[PDB]
Amino acid sequence: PHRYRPGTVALREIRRYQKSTELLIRKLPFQRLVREIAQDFKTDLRFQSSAVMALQEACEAYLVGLFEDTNLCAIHAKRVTIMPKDIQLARRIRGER
Amino acid sequence: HRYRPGTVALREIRRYQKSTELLIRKLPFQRLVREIAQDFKTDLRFQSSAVMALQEACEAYLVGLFEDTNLCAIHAKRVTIMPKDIQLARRIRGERA
Amino acid sequence: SRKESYSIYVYKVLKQVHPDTGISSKAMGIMNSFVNDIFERIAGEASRLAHYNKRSTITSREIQTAVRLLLPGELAKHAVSEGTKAVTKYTSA
Amino acid sequence: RSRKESYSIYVYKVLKQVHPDTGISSKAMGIMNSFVNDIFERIAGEASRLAHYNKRSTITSREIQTAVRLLLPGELAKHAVSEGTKAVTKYTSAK
Amino acid sequence: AKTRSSRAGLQFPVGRVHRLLRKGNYSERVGAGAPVYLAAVLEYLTAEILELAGNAARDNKKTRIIPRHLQLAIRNDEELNKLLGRVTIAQGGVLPNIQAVLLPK
Amino acid sequence: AKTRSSRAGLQFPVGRVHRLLRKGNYSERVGAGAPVYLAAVLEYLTAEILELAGNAARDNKKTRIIPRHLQLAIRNDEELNKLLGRVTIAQGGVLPNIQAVLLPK
Amino acid sequence: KVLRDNIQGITKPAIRRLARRGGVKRISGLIYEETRGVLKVFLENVIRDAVTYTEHAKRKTVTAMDVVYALKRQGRTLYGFGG
Amino acid sequence: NIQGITKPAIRRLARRGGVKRISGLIYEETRGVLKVFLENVIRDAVTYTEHAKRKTVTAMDVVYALKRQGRTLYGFGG
DNA sequence: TGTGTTTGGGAATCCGGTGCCGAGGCCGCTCAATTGGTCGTAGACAGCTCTAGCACCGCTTAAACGCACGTACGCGCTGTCCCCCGC
DNA sequence: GCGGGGGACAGCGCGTACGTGCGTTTAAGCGGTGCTAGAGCTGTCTACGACCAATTGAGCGGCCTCGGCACCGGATTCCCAAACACA
């Protein structure tokens, strides 16, 4: 029939998403996650919709930057697959805890 | 007699992490700071404590940079630090574009 | 209640730069945020300089020093040039 | 002869409270002075921001408490709030 | 009565910047040339970014500037990138960039 | 006449902190309890650091605290380490730390 | 209703999409959980501050301005939501 | 004049960082980075001095120049 | 070809003497904190409006999930060659 | 500056885990409705903090002393690097 080689569609998806701007996390599950996290600090908290939007924007930006640094670390290790140790190294160097 | 390679490296690592004094010769660093400052304003004078502060800050910065470089080198499954490790650490830290 | 923005000034500047290009509302929001952020950076640095020179007024000199501290090389050069030009013209008239 | 301001004597009193048979070198006293000034400026600046944010004109103990919660890590913030509230309680209870 | 901005040849509001400086508790007193200098600097930076963003928008056959264009303008100019380095832009995306290792031989 | 610090049961100078708050242009007005609360917080933080530093000094058979002991105290306490993370301490040194990979088999 | 175990709403394809935006070509299988950890931490750090800023103002509702202010307090300023 | 930062000095700085083995090309890189850092600090320090009408760079100017980059330094009158 | 243990030997550590300089205490002074009192206003409180956050429902379809299948990348192993290390 | 040995880098194999694709399932997204908690604004009045003149003692500069710490040498100990006996 027809089947593309491994990694061709990966590059195609890289070009499509690095070219677009739309948010890559589903909005409703993220809203639920935010609410359930904030439930641990004060009960019965309401949120402006734009507050959750700002939180999602910030989280996606943070994760994209983190994935850039993870990919750099992985390439530095002569690998192509990113691994959790790459994430741990990137956050360790970045100064996060 | 001879010591096995890398053993004295470890001994000096312990020796220098145990201590606290400055690891750069004071007078070459003072000459370098004065030389650098000559490009910004001419005929400047430095209090000794000013040069001491600059030396302490620079040494701390370089030690932190070498910590990150060591992390990068271990990540690539090496023991020797290479200029690529410094560049990757500085790039992740956000200093190098 | 009244609301504060730099929308109209940014739009005027853009028309001075690219006379046939418009700008979204979202991009105007971002430009307003950027102008504010830079304003606070400069003003805070100038206040710091003034209090750490035991000095009580914020003059154009404090603003200029803050600009050299905040802006990168060529940007600081040109910004200082524009600021000096503006102060000279303002005081001449 | 200028006027110099420091926290050497108060830091020494706190040290005598904590470790009575223990002294502090002059370099360490300078470091502790720097630390105290740094923390003071951090807390005061955060409190000033909070006072401004709420379009508010006064820095009260509430702003200091909120700034302490914002800056210090959790357990440290909890103990710091306990100590500060205890101190203000004692200060206002007496007269 | 002619406004301070007009007398200085600017488009940013000198009087408004002066008011914010006074009502911002930066210092007890504010010189006359400080708001003029600050307004000139702000106007210059805004003009630079709007230049670059308009160029980027025209590079995409777009006649309006959107946050994506602002992000491309900022991230492509190295001194602007240094200035706005710790800043994230809503709906901004990232620069198209693929490591040369990941591309096929 | 009893001092404000005494009335609050503190050893840090409440009056001095109040003076610095007024003469620091943090706000136009300063509440009565603000210097007391702030002085209490500074005293508590100083007490924590002096605790940890005294312990570290006693760990080296030393009866005086030197910058090395303060540095070790800060870097060994995780909440203090978070607080003073971007801070470098003159004559402080670093924590003894060698990666487990570098040790010989 | 109680809100429980919503971290699984960050699905594997969403994490892959985020990695694609980051220029990543191959993703290990253990990445997805690690990411859900990192994200959960980031959120806790941001929300704790936003909630604090809301408590101080006596409000029961977290506004977008509190989130922006918490972010800039973490040195991670955000453009486009006011302020 | 950057050469005053000798090979053994960089070796010691790396040793304090826990580095066991150092390549031969590290030194010219390290010198470069350090020089850049110094220029970025000294520039600001000098700017503070020139703003203060002074001709002497004081340790306090250096402390504020370091705090500028978020490199707060304790122990020099800060 | 391999490796448990040996043992002289440099290198870090402990201990005692000593001396020296800064930390801790004491005194005289002064200036900044304290007291008491006046006065202005910042904000705490009540109270009122209206918006925008929450809860729910139904429907469509796009995305997530599970699974099959194959190949290509990670990782272990071997070799060599050279370039940092120890002196 | 030099001898050399370990590590970096090259090459190969293999095996399983990740990418691609297909069909099924699920819940996200959109719209539409309704309710009410709470955000935002306004008026009052009151307690609370700024300002000022007078008092004074707490803190700061200056001197002086001695003990904690640095330093030196001598003895103790503790990791070390192959060589040997023996598998």
Numbering used by the authors:
A (entry chain a): 38 to 134
B (entry chain e): 39 to 135
C (entry chain h): 29 to 121
D (entry chain d): 28 to 122
E (entry chain g), F (entry chain c): 14 to 118
G (entry chain b): 20 to 102
H (entry chain f): 25 to 102
Paper's wording?
In chromatin, linker histone H1 binds to nucleosomes, forming chromatosomes, and changes the transcription status. Here we report the cryo-electron microscopy (cryo-EM) structures of transcribing RNAPII-chromatosome complexes (forms I and II), in which RNAPII is paused at the entry linker DNA region of the chromatosome due to H1 binding. The nucleosome is composed of linker DNAs and the nucleosome core particle (NCP), which folds an approximately 150 base-pair DNA segment into a histone octamer, comprising the four core histones H2A, H2B, H3, and H4. H1 binding to the nucleosome induces structural changes in chromatin, thus regulating transcription processes catalyzed by RNA polymerase II (RNAPII).
The form I complex is the predominant configuration of the RNAPII-chromatosome complex. In this complex, the globular domain of H1 binds to the DNA at the nucleosomal dyad (on-dyad binding). The structure of the chromatosome complexed with RNAPII is similar to that of the RNAPII-free chromatosome. The H1 binding restricts the orientation and flexibility of the linker DNAs. Surprisingly, we found that the exit linker DNA fixed by H1 collides with the clamp (the Rpb1 clamp core domain) of the RNAPII transcribing the entry linker DNA. The H1 globular domain does not directly interact with RNAPII. The specific interaction of RNAPII with the exit linker DNA would hinder the RNAPII progression on the entry linker DNA. In the form I complex, the H1 bound to the nucleosome restricts the linker DNA orientation, and the exit linker DNA is captured by the RNAPII DNA binding cleft. As shown in the form I complex, the exit linker DNA directly interacts with the RNAPII DNA-binding cleft, thus inducing the RNAPII pausing. Interestingly, when the Spt4/5-bound RNAPII structure was superimposed on the current RNAPII-chromatosome complex, Spt4/5 overlapped with the exit linker DNA in the form I complex.
